[PDB]
Design a binder for this molecule. Structure first.
Ligand SMILES: Nc1ncnc2c1ncn2[C@@H]1O[C@H](COP(=O)(O)OP(=O)(O)O)[C@@H](O)[C@H]1O
Ligand SMILES: Nc1ncnc2c1ncn2[C@@H]1O[C@H](COP(=O)(O)O)[C@@H](O)[C@H]1O
Length: 196
Protein backbone atom coordinates (compact mmCIF):
# COMPACT_ATOMS: atom_id res chain seq x y z
CA UNK A 1 0.00 0.00 0.00
CA UNK A 2 1.16 3.60 -0.46
CA UNK A 3 0.95 3.93 3.33
CA UNK A 4 1.05 1.66 6.35
CA UNK A 5 -1.79 1.85 8.89
CA UNK A 6 0.77 3.40 11.26
CA UNK A 7 1.37 6.44 9.09
CA UNK A 8 -2.24 6.88 8.03
CA UNK A 9 -5.28 5.85 10.08
CA UNK A 10 -8.44 5.50 7.97
CA UNK A 11 -11.98 5.00 9.28
CA UNK A 12 -14.52 4.47 6.50
CA UNK A 13 -17.86 6.04 7.45
CA UNK A 14 -20.60 4.22 5.60
CA UNK A 15 -24.37 4.11 5.40
CA UNK A 16 -27.07 5.12 2.94
CA UNK A 17 -27.73 8.68 1.78
CA UNK A 18 -29.17 10.85 4.56
CA UNK A 19 -28.12 8.46 7.35
CA UNK A 20 -26.27 11.35 9.01
CA UNK A 21 -22.70 10.56 7.94
CA UNK A 22 -21.72 14.09 7.02
CA UNK A 23 -23.45 15.48 10.10
CA UNK A 24 -21.62 13.16 12.53
CA UNK A 25 -18.28 13.52 10.78
CA UNK A 26 -18.49 17.26 11.11
CA UNK A 27 -19.09 16.94 14.83
CA UNK A 28 -16.28 14.44 15.21
CA UNK A 29 -13.75 16.77 13.66
CA UNK A 30 -14.44 19.26 16.46
CA UNK A 31 -13.53 16.75 19.16
CA UNK A 32 -11.00 14.52 17.43
CA UNK A 33 -7.89 15.09 15.32
CA UNK A 34 -9.48 13.39 12.32
CA UNK A 35 -9.69 15.06 8.96
CA UNK A 36 -13.08 14.57 7.33
CA UNK A 37 -12.96 13.66 3.65
CA UNK A 38 -16.32 13.28 1.88
CA UNK A 39 -16.29 11.34 -1.37
CA UNK A 40 -19.44 13.14 -2.50
CA UNK A 41 -17.82 16.50 -1.80
CA UNK A 42 -14.61 15.55 -3.63
CA UNK A 43 -16.67 14.49 -6.62
CA UNK A 44 -18.83 17.57 -6.60
CA UNK A 45 -15.69 19.73 -6.47
CA UNK A 46 -14.16 18.00 -9.50
CA UNK A 47 -17.47 18.27 -11.34
CA UNK A 48 -17.33 22.04 -11.14
CA UNK A 49 -13.59 22.41 -11.66
CA UNK A 50 -12.74 24.60 -14.65
CA UNK A 51 -10.99 22.40 -17.15
CA UNK A 52 -12.11 19.06 -15.68
CA UNK A 53 -12.69 16.38 -18.35
CA UNK A 54 -14.98 14.64 -15.84
CA UNK A 55 -17.58 17.37 -15.45
CA UNK A 56 -20.33 15.74 -17.44
CA UNK A 57 -19.56 12.19 -16.34
CA UNK A 58 -19.77 13.04 -12.60
CA UNK A 59 -22.83 15.24 -13.18
CA UNK A 60 -24.64 12.36 -14.78
CA UNK A 61 -23.53 9.74 -12.29
CA UNK A 62 -24.75 11.89 -9.36
CA UNK A 63 -28.18 12.59 -10.90
CA UNK A 64 -28.65 8.89 -11.63
CA UNK A 65 -27.32 7.89 -8.23
CA UNK A 66 -24.59 5.89 -9.96
CA UNK A 67 -21.18 4.97 -8.60
CA UNK A 68 -18.57 7.11 -10.40
CA UNK A 69 -15.76 4.89 -11.82
CA UNK A 70 -13.19 4.03 -9.17
CA UNK A 71 -10.32 5.41 -11.25
CA UNK A 72 -11.68 8.91 -11.00
CA UNK A 73 -12.87 8.49 -7.39
CA UNK A 74 -9.67 6.95 -6.11
CA UNK A 75 -7.54 9.59 -7.78
CA UNK A 76 -9.43 12.39 -6.05
CA UNK A 77 -9.29 10.61 -2.72
CA UNK A 78 -5.59 9.81 -3.04
CA UNK A 79 -4.76 13.43 -3.82
CA UNK A 80 -6.74 14.70 -0.83
CA UNK A 81 -5.16 12.16 1.50
CA UNK A 82 -1.70 13.09 0.18
CA UNK A 83 -2.24 16.81 0.64
CA UNK A 84 -3.18 16.11 4.25
CA UNK A 85 -0.41 13.70 5.13
CA UNK A 86 1.96 16.30 3.68
CA UNK A 87 0.41 18.81 6.09
CA UNK A 88 0.97 16.23 8.88
CA UNK A 89 -2.61 15.05 9.11
CA UNK A 90 -2.54 11.27 9.52
CA UNK A 91 -6.08 10.45 10.71
CA UNK A 92 -9.03 10.45 8.35
CA UNK A 93 -12.77 9.94 8.47
CA UNK A 94 -13.55 9.02 4.86
CA UNK A 95 -17.25 9.44 4.48
CA UNK A 96 -19.12 7.78 1.62
CA UNK A 97 -16.30 5.56 0.45
CA UNK A 98 -15.98 2.72 -0.44
CA UNK A 99 -19.35 2.36 -2.08
CA UNK A 100 -18.48 -0.50 -4.40
CA UNK A 101 -16.33 -3.60 -4.01
CA UNK A 102 -13.79 -2.61 -6.65
CA UNK A 103 -12.91 0.70 -5.02
CA UNK A 104 -12.88 -0.98 -1.62
CA UNK A 105 -10.26 -3.52 -2.66
CA UNK A 106 -8.24 -1.03 -4.70
CA UNK A 107 -8.14 1.44 -1.83
CA UNK A 108 -7.01 -1.02 0.78
CA UNK A 109 -4.45 -2.56 -1.52
CA UNK A 110 -2.96 0.57 -3.14
CA UNK A 111 -3.40 3.23 -0.49
CA UNK A 112 -3.85 1.87 3.01
CA UNK A 113 -5.78 -0.75 4.92
CA UNK A 114 -8.54 0.87 6.97
CA UNK A 115 -8.66 0.72 10.77
CA UNK A 116 -12.39 0.08 10.93
CA UNK A 117 -15.69 0.92 9.26
CA UNK A 118 -18.24 3.04 11.11
CA UNK A 119 -21.59 1.98 9.62
CA UNK A 120 -24.69 4.08 10.18
CA UNK A 121 -27.43 1.49 10.22
CA UNK A 122 -30.48 3.41 9.07
CA UNK A 123 -34.08 2.52 8.13
CA UNK A 124 -34.92 3.76 4.65
CA UNK A 125 -38.03 5.67 5.64
CA UNK A 126 -35.84 7.68 8.02
CA UNK A 127 -33.21 8.33 5.37
CA UNK A 128 -35.99 9.34 2.97
CA UNK A 129 -37.56 11.94 5.24
CA UNK A 130 -34.13 13.45 6.01
CA UNK A 131 -33.24 13.73 2.31
CA UNK A 132 -36.54 15.36 1.36
CA UNK A 133 -36.03 17.82 4.21
CA UNK A 134 -32.43 18.36 3.08
CA UNK A 135 -33.58 18.86 -0.49
CA UNK A 136 -35.76 21.76 0.64
CA UNK A 137 -33.17 23.17 3.04
CA UNK A 138 -30.05 22.98 0.86
CA UNK A 139 -31.26 22.37 -2.67
CA UNK A 140 -28.65 19.74 -3.64
CA UNK A 141 -29.39 18.62 -7.19
CA UNK A 142 -29.73 14.90 -6.36
CA UNK A 143 -31.96 15.46 -3.32
CA UNK A 144 -35.07 14.97 -5.44
CA UNK A 145 -37.31 11.89 -5.17
CA UNK A 146 -36.35 10.45 -8.56
CA UNK A 147 -32.60 10.53 -7.84
CA UNK A 148 -33.20 9.54 -4.20
CA UNK A 149 -34.88 6.28 -5.26
CA UNK A 150 -31.89 5.55 -7.53
CA UNK A 151 -29.47 6.32 -4.66
CA UNK A 152 -31.36 3.93 -2.31
CA UNK A 153 -31.28 1.21 -5.02
CA UNK A 154 -27.56 1.64 -5.64
CA UNK A 155 -26.99 1.65 -1.91
CA UNK A 156 -28.75 -1.68 -1.47
CA UNK A 157 -27.49 -3.42 -4.60
CA UNK A 158 -23.97 -2.04 -4.78
CA UNK A 159 -22.93 -0.56 -1.49
CA UNK A 160 -24.36 -3.05 0.98
CA UNK A 161 -22.17 -5.90 -0.36
CA UNK A 162 -19.18 -3.82 0.77
CA UNK A 163 -20.52 -3.75 4.33
CA UNK A 164 -20.95 -7.53 4.23
CA UNK A 165 -17.36 -7.81 3.01
CA UNK A 166 -15.86 -5.82 5.85
CA UNK A 167 -18.17 -7.48 8.30
CA UNK A 168 -16.55 -10.83 7.53
CA UNK A 169 -13.25 -9.27 8.52
CA UNK A 170 -14.81 -8.08 11.79
CA UNK A 171 -14.07 -4.45 10.96
CA UNK A 172 -17.60 -3.06 11.05
CA UNK A 173 -18.96 -1.03 13.99
CA UNK A 174 -22.73 -0.36 13.60
CA UNK A 175 -24.37 2.77 14.98
CA UNK A 176 -28.12 3.40 14.79
CA UNK A 177 -28.93 6.51 12.78
CA UNK A 178 -32.49 6.93 14.00
CA UNK A 179 -31.98 9.05 17.11
CA UNK A 180 -31.34 12.75 17.66
CA UNK A 181 -28.05 14.15 16.40
CA UNK A 182 -26.82 14.31 20.02
CA UNK A 183 -27.86 10.84 20.96
CA UNK A 184 -26.34 9.38 17.80
CA UNK A 185 -23.15 11.30 18.49
CA UNK A 186 -22.90 9.76 21.94
CA UNK A 187 -22.88 6.29 20.37
CA UNK A 188 -20.43 7.44 17.71
CA UNK A 189 -18.06 8.71 20.41
CA UNK A 190 -18.43 5.47 22.36
CA UNK A 191 -17.65 3.42 19.25
CA UNK A 192 -14.55 5.53 18.48
CA UNK A 193 -13.32 5.39 22.09
CA UNK A 194 -13.68 1.65 22.09
CA UNK A 195 -12.22 1.25 18.62
CA UNK A 196 -8.94 3.14 19.03
N1 LIG B 1 -29.85 12.23 13.72
C1 LIG B 1 -30.45 13.09 12.92
N2 LIG B 1 -31.71 13.47 13.13
C2 LIG B 1 -32.33 14.33 12.31
N3 LIG B 1 -31.84 14.91 11.22
C3 LIG B 1 -30.54 14.54 10.99
C4 LIG B 1 -29.81 13.64 11.80
N4 LIG B 1 -28.56 13.53 11.27
C5 LIG B 1 -28.49 14.28 10.23
N5 LIG B 1 -29.67 14.91 10.01
C6 LIG B 1 -29.89 15.55 8.76
O1 LIG B 1 -30.67 14.92 7.74
C7 LIG B 1 -29.98 15.18 6.51
C8 LIG B 1 -29.02 14.03 6.22
O2 LIG B 1 -27.89 14.02 7.09
P1 LIG B 1 -26.48 14.03 6.46
O3 LIG B 1 -25.53 14.15 7.53
O4 LIG B 1 -26.44 15.07 5.51
O5 LIG B 1 -26.34 12.67 5.71
P2 LIG B 1 -25.41 11.78 4.86
O6 LIG B 1 -24.16 12.47 4.81
O7 LIG B 1 -25.36 10.43 5.36
O8 LIG B 1 -25.97 11.75 3.45
C9 LIG B 1 -29.32 16.59 6.69
O9 LIG B 1 -30.29 17.58 6.41
C10 LIG B 1 -28.94 16.60 8.18
O10 LIG B 1 -29.07 17.89 8.81
N1 LIG C 1 -17.46 6.44 -3.09
C1 LIG C 1 -18.02 6.85 -4.25
N2 LIG C 1 -17.71 6.29 -5.44
C2 LIG C 1 -18.34 6.68 -6.54
N3 LIG C 1 -19.31 7.60 -6.70
C3 LIG C 1 -19.61 8.19 -5.49
C4 LIG C 1 -18.99 7.84 -4.25
N4 LIG C 1 -19.52 8.64 -3.27
C5 LIG C 1 -20.41 9.40 -3.79
N5 LIG C 1 -20.51 9.17 -5.13
C6 LIG C 1 -21.59 9.78 -5.82
O1 LIG C 1 -21.88 11.14 -5.66
C7 LIG C 1 -23.25 11.13 -5.23
C8 LIG C 1 -23.41 11.92 -3.96
O2 LIG C 1 -22.79 11.31 -2.83
P1 LIG C 1 -23.10 11.79 -1.35
O3 LIG C 1 -22.93 13.18 -1.25
O4 LIG C 1 -22.31 10.99 -0.47
O5 LIG C 1 -24.57 11.47 -1.21
C9 LIG C 1 -23.58 9.62 -5.02
O6 LIG C 1 -24.97 9.31 -5.12
C10 LIG C 1 -22.84 8.96 -6.19
O7 LIG C 1 -23.47 9.32 -7.41
Amino acid sequence: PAFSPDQVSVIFVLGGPGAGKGTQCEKLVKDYSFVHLSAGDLLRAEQGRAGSQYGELIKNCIKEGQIVPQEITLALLRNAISDNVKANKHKFLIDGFPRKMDQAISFERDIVESKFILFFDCPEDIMLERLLERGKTSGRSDDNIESIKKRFNTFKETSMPVIEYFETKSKVVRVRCDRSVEDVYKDVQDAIRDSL
